[PDB]
Amino acid sequence: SGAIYVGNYRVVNRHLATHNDWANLVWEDSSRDLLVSSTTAQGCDTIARCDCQTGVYYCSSRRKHYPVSFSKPSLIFVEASEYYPARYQSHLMLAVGHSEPGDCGGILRCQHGVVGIVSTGGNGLVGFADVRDLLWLDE
Numbered sequence: 001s002g003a004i005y006v007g008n009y010r011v012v013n014r015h016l017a018t019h020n021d022w023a024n025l026v027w028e029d030s031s032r033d034l035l036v037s038s039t040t041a042q043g044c045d046t047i048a049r050c051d052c053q054t055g056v057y058y059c060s061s062r063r064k065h066y067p068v069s070f071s072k073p074s075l076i077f078v079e080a081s082e083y084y085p086a087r088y089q090s091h092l093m094l095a096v097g098h099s100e101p102g103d104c105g106g107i108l109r110c111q112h113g114v115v116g117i118v119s120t121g122g123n124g125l126v127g128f129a130d131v132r133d134l135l136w137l138d139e
């Protein structure tokens with residue numbers, strides 16, 4: 001589990017969105033496994049606006065942060081789950097690292113700020129959903 005809070009927005013994995021998230025829907029995209037909802041209270045996370053390929057991610061199944069090298073955001077084939085059929089998920093970044101299903105939502109961050117959140121995993125490869133191109137999260 002886990003989310004990003006910047007201004008009046010909450011960024012979660014789409015497959016983990018709540019009834020309150022859908023009742024206050026700003027934007028959602030199944031191909032990216034992303035959902036943004038609106039908040040009464042103000043968030044104070046900083047979103048990275050960069051092309052970094054190294055960073056640290058939080059892994060709840062180990063209660064640890066790990067340094068990783070990741071690929072640039074791209075279209076990557078993801079296996080079928082109870083939330084989606086087998087498909088290409090867009091804006092996905094891969095890293096060699098540990099993850100489990102309950103690890104989705106954990107933040108990946110570089111020296112510039114939040115880059116994205118854990119979204120996929122398997123075969124000792126962890127996939128992150130990029131949020132750096134969503135320029136409207138600040139404005």
Ligand SMILES: C=Cc1ncccc1CC(=O)N1CCC[C@H](C(N)=O)C1
Binds near residue numbers: 015081099119
């Ligand atoms: C990411 C957790 C994970 N890690 C290791 C093993 C298995 C998983 C589960 C996983 O990858 N997904 C199930 C939830 C939906 C995801 C998606 N974006 O399509 C895919």
Ligand SMILES: [Zn+2]
Binds near residue numbers: 049050111112113
């Ligand atoms: Zn950066």
